[PDB]
Subunit: 154 residues, 12 copies
């Protein structure tokens, strides 16, 4: 059916998003700078590692549904909807970019969970339901770095 | 049992209640901290909070080991505690200052309460306070450092 | 709004976890009799599982751009579970625990439905996972109240 | 309610299926042979152990719902709908049988999750939703062994 | 033949013993799930712990057959046909569960001593050793269970 | 000094008490019976193991003070002040005996800490101060088993 | 034209990008492998993939330690890499053949790049390549064995 | 007196031997001295700990045979046939004493294994058969310390 | 037991120890030289079973010391004492497996015989050592034999 | 002030831990003879226990609103233990170690009393705990100097 | 002097440097202050710990070459070329000092690796080659703290 | 190239040396005696285990270079240049022999690293460079046992 095919389409996009989001996190991990270096270097590795784990989950979900994941490295940027990071960025800009990307993924996961549910694919709906919570945690952490008036440094 | 044994038991109830409120305060700071120091402070509050947390059971069970009862009814904690339960929206600086003030109260009380235990010949309870107070002194030091200025990088 | 309603549920659920945990600590400390070690452990074990839910429920509020309950004075004002009061027999502790678990189980089913209606799949999932632990705890506790084992009842 | 009684009926069937499926896996583990022995001996133990873990989960779910699990050993083959393995089998046949049984369980778990959901039993629906993904993984692994044209041995 | 009979007999013992381990394990799970009353946590754990030790024996006994160029019991429908332990039936009190477990353990202990002797006669030192090791676990389980049935502790009996 | 030789006398008695108390616990561990078997079997092993750890601590404290511990096995019952367990006992009797012995040890450790303090032996005072809290825990646990009116079995 | 910092940094960018592409290739093989060798090969590809994966951070952070920058923009990886990104449906034999070819390219480049680093006096970078190349040599050996025939059991 | 009663008699003696042998090892551990101190302090603790583990095994074996272990602390020296260590000893003398006691236990375990075998008690025979190998290891280690002509210190 | 018989148990331990050393080295050969589409699976099999044989070397050697004897120790002595066939020349994977089975069968036979000898000597510990170790060899033999079976329906 | 008397003790004690640790490293590296492995290990093990005290003693100063010794040039100015000098026999190393441990034990007893009189129960406790480790080390070392073992002395 | 005695000279200097650099890190760990306290307290301990591990490696390298390491505590400041930290410093100053010392050590390790290589001492060359990379990591981390324009706090 | 095939010859010799050196260490482990027994029994096992690990590294290096390791057990003593231990030895003689063999291996590893470097085989050069350091450690340890004038036992 087209709903089942639709589910496979969501998994490819979601998987590609996980790959690009992970690579973005590595960029921030490597290129972060300033007095917050150790803290942020760690933040980006930690949240990056959680996104990383999703790559294999989303890819193998396609296989479990008798489909194929994205696999050719050249295909990732063709199917991803997350923005691949480009150019020199300030730490503030890295965090802003990460939040925007997380918000896109969160919106997509809710949409994709609904598609899976309509397809009767309770497993894929559950996968998205679990993974979206990690994104919501990442978004919260990142947003806090952007708050001011802490009375110590902002 | 004796009047002095009852006084030791009274100290344990107050100290236990303080550990509970102090823990819950740390959770507030953990959850509500914000700004560019978020990850570092989020962890700090969880780490120190966890160390205070461990004291709850130690102080409570000490009462039992002395043939008494700990504070146990949730409604009693705020009636017995002498530390200030955190109230309202706070800046991170305010959280840290509040934590220091509460730690200083606990430090003072633990020194007083160790002396009461010692007077009662209760070497175990005196030892408990003597060990735990050192953790409070560590927490106080960490927190006070966050309030220092002139680091040359961000203050 | 359904989204504001979700946040309201999280505050109540979080406060319930805190009170439920503190209740378990009371049972842990005050249990007595020939079943002491077994029950002392039971109360700690189930207490520890309830404890873990406090942070989960609190941080869920933050992830939804809200705030958790945080002021210690607010917990007993928001909680719907009964905070334990006065001297209790072991049987009474267990009965109280079951009643509170049953309230939480009912509320988590209600609150999962509210989250689902709001489209908040994550919060619905949180309640769906946590309620199973409460259902386990309820079963364990209920078994202690059964009679006719042929050994001691 | 009658729906809640229905949920308990599903749990007994599902639990019994877990037991029979596990014992089937042990058969394959023990009786597998040929040049793929170590690889398949391990596969059958690994997937068998994941099915095994489900036995206690499905049984205790009945208790948490104020019911009783299947418990009398004589009752398992009376309640289970999966095919208990019978007779001497080739490795190919073992894999084919396993896939068929997994597909039956997958079908049943989707049906049973919907029954639980209609009963308002979110916990049981979730249990089936989580467990079915493990079955889907097992099915995919097994199906891969049956593919040909790898260019090395088939 | 006279040459192969003892080894054939050893294989027969392993199938029975393996089948007994499976039924005994499943019995333990019944007790684990269905136990009740003020001893719940303690006994819930006991049944799981002893059940887990019996469980481990299933693969040991099954693979022993393979190591002797035979085959274990494997078809699920065969287990109850080959087992000599009583598969648990019906609603039981906790006392009844314990008594049933003891009786089954005693049957297995007797059989393992008999089967060790058969293996020893066959010159099968490995299989005799397997039974010799496993029977001690059954003896431990039997002792634990029997203690629960003692009275006059002064606290609850 | 004389007070230093007095401290050494306390350590020999305390060490011997730990040995006898440990062996008493092993008796209770082995000979406990009835419907509380697993729980009490574990209790006696757990508390026994904590008493056990004290043997080496108390023995080596003597060496650290340029003295010698009790060492000849025949000496332990000559030096110990705790009652070595004798004869067939009910579980209730075992627990009552254990409590009485713990209370003797608790009393002695307070006395012996005072003796150490008077001698300026802060280390030995500290040893007793730490160990006595474990005895107080053990006493509490044991006393609880003797309480009645739980509403379930007493 | 360029500083010796720059030539070494150029090598690290290419090597880092190669590690990323090689890793993603291994994931393709991991996911798309099939046939009676599935479990064995599924594991092989994950294991060797994981070892290549670990190199990404090492090679990237080496650039930072040399006061340079790694490749970081995801769009840049395929523009800098010299290994062939895997394309289209492949048999298992073809996956293994492709992997060997890519490993051989990397092994050649790492020897060249170690020499460049050594000439620049960059003993650390030379050492990094010297260590990493041995893992590639192991992977190549493993892969090559799968292509051998005449085992007497299945080939 | 049946050979089953005889088996129980052997277990009580062997259990008591384990207790006394362990306490002897503790004496050697505490009282060793000289330039070999750390090495021998560790040896005595290591071999002592392996003997220690036998105490519970031998005691609980009695229980599994529907008997009772030695349990009253005052009974151990009455039942044991190993020599309890007496008086100040040189390190050489401690080692010689340990070897002699190990050789007694080794002899007894062979005798006791035969008694168990004659009783049809395959489990108890096995216990002695396993434990005796540990004693044989200990004996070997100890005997090596007594050898001369190493060319470094003897 | 007579001196002759005690010496005979010691002789069995030397042979058994030397066999463990050669069997181990044989397994390393198979580990290193295995090839073909089963490479990873067999590379691991040979290492796993080799590692279990390896562990036996120290057990069998130290058993001699515990009996007031000496193990084989001079490297030149191993091939003089061992009765298992040291692997020789280029072999197919099938040939490696066949060789391993034959050697395991020899060791299994010897361990049963040597357990009898130890039992006759009253040496219950040595009899036990052989009784335990032979089961590992029986497991290894089973695993290896399975690789030689045909008609799996997938690759044979 | 009495606050500064306690702080004075902590600086001396901290400096002593640093010097004592470095001494242990010398013994670890320079020990020789047929007891090599055993002594190499002994010196590392006891050295490691002394090492752990450095941070405890330094941070205690910070917890009392003071500062620890920190400038590396200050350690030998503040320490009262003898820094090891020149080539030594193994016997001499052990003798030197015992002497320094005895000095530290004496000082910790004195310094515990100073803290107790200042009402600084935490600092008194620190010294009370650490001195027991020194007492253990002293015992171990002294045993190596005993004779008449019947095997090698 | 011979190339061999030259290598030993380098190890003494390098070892002494490791000791002084470690003690400097402890100063920074203890005396750091301000709103970055936890992050920097940890950084200094982490990098300090990695420098610490080098002390034994460099010292024992001397022994392996039939020489002797620096060992007299009074010798460290006489042999080390790194600047021992002196006086009250701001956090910025601590980081600047650490970078300068790491840069000194990095330069020296490259020089000393070349000396070892010329001596044919491949082991010592390798030791320096490995250790210098840790210093290069530490230098990078520290330099990042000194960067400005992150958009959050600088 | 000619240097390339030469590298393979070095690996065969080195691998064979690791096997013989390991078997030598086992001899010393088993046959060591006297009052230093535990210490030396451990030393020989510890250093033996480190030599043991080199066997697989050196063998598989040959495979990674498209060659073959030594593998026929009969070939080891034909290819090894280290002296296989022969006859009854004093502990002193065991240590002296071990040192001589280590010195041969250290010499050869330096020579073989140079050969690999000439061949452009940076991996094999590195392997030798790493392994030689372990041999240098073992040599140092062993040499220390031969020193006299410790003031305690020599
Ligand atoms: Cl952190
Ligand atoms: Cl438990
Ligand atoms: Cl595997
Ligand atoms: Cl050691």
């Amino acid at each position: 059916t087209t709903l089942k095919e639709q589910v496979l389409t969501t998994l490819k996009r979601e998987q590609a998003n996980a790959v690009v989001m992970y690579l973005n996190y590595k960029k921030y991990h490597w290129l972060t700078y300033g007095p917050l270096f150790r803290d942020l270097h760690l933040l980006f590795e930690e949240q990056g590692s959680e996104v990383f784990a999703m790559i294999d989950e989303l890819a193998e979900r396609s296989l479990m549904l008798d489909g194929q994941p994205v696999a050719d490295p050249a295909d990732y940027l063709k199917v991803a909807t997350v923005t691949p990071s480009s150019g020199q960025l300030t730490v503030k800009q890295m965090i802003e970019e990460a939040i925007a990307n997380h918000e896109l993924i969160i919106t997509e996961m809710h949409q994709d969970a609904e598609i899976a549910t309509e397809a009767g694919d309770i497993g894929t709906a559950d996968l998205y339901t679990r993974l979206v919570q990690t994104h919501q945690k990442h978004r919260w952490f990142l947003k806090e770095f952007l708050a001011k008036g802490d009375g110590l440094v902002s």
